[PDB]
Write a protein that binds this ligand. Structure first.
Ligand SMILES: Nc1nc2c(ncn2[C@@H]2O[C@H](COP(=O)(O)O)[C@@H](O)[C@H]2O)c(=O)[nH]1
Ligand SMILES: Nc1nc2c(ncn2[C@@H]2O[C@H](COP(=O)(O)O)[C@@H](O)[C@H]2O)c(=O)[nH]1
Lengths: 190, 196
């Protein structure tokens, strides 16, 4: 199955849509479990949301060549390990990736050959309004995420970068566009 | 040189407690040990979670995986396939954890011919009758499956005496007794993993 790379600004809803996509389509999709050095959030599960490792363990895995790609966000390391993608491929499931723009760039040079989907908010201020109204992290983490969102949004205008660009006006609308873009591949796996 | 921490292979009959023993070891020593998630073609039971207890796949998928070289070992047990994939072991090693595996007798013999070099521990029930009672009391098994598991279980206990096969044999009379024996047998293993 062709992998699916979900990107876009952090907080724009790509993870909410991803979770709904996997829950609605049992047996079809598998989530790529990235490594990260950031602290886990309450409710996040090691080996399910991320492989939560120390910086020392992350650098050792990097040096061993464990990662298809790795990146930095807010002073922490993230990466897609070969094992995380191979684990889904060994299930014959559609592997779904959730990475930032730099991950998209590096994945372009690999043999994965996925479909690239960007999940964009309607505007930078609407994204901040949604994240501030949530009020789930400090001003430092929020602003660091919003600063990264500015760069992620401007690059969605690059021709050929993303196969599909979804603007999250509402989560139901954005999910309907996600299912349409993957309709042929879902039908194939089904 | 003195060996460092090695993978841990637990074998013995299902229903004799090796899985519940392993879950206690994993939840109480998660800073040291990680679980190898085997593939199986048998159907999931209630309470089992794909990617945690097993990778539940079809035979067609598992055989294609085998042909692709994905597996360290694989075996046929009671009509279904089970196997330890390379990525299962590597995922635990990428976590800076020591891999613990739960396999049948064929898997023990399979792993002996690999470069894993684990410690081999056999978890035995008090008797075949107590095992037959525990198995049928847990249900989730056809009569044909229960019979095949009982016949495989007698081979388990007989193999526990084969010289040089297992490093440790634990008779699981009670879980607390069997767990304390498991930690004692893994005392040097835990020390080595914590010092690295
Ligand atoms: N390049 C790359 N980015 C990732 C990876 N995992 C998560 N990210 C991205 O890192 C950002 C921070 O993720 P969060 O910390 O909010 O989970 C998000 O944009 C997310 O998509 C990864 O494995 N590789
Ligand atoms: N050889 C081998 N045996 C396994 C593997 N995974 C589970 N088994 C064994 O297969 C038997 C049946 O497992 P159950 O169906 O009771 O979960 C048990 O003895 C179990 O330990 C594996 O990956 N390889």
């Amino acid at each position: 199955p062709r992998p699916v790379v979900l990107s876009g600004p952090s907080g724009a809803g790509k993870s909410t849509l991803l979770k709904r996509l996997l829950q609605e389509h049992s047996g079809i999709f598998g989530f790529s479990v990235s490594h990260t050095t950031r602290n886990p959030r309450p409710g996040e599960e090691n080996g399910k949301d991320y492989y939560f490792v120390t910086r020392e363990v992350m650098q050792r895995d990097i040096a061993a060549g464990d990662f298809i790609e790795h990146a930095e966000f807010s002073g922490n390391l993230y990466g897609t390990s070969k094992v995380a993608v191979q684990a889904v491929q060994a299930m014959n499931r559609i592997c779904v990736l959730d990475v930032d723009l730099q991950g998209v760039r590096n994945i372009k040079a690999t043999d994965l050959r996925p479909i690239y989907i960007s999940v964009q908010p309607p505007s930078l201020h609407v994204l901040e309004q949604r994240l501030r109204q949530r009020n789930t992290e400090t001003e430092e983490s929020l602003v660091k995420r919003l600063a990264a969102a500015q760069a992620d949004m401007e690059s969605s205008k690059e021709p050929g970068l993303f196969d599909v660009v979804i603007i999250n006006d509402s989560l139901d609308q954005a999910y309907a566009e996600l299912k349409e873009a993957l309709s042929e591949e879902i039908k194939k796996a089904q």
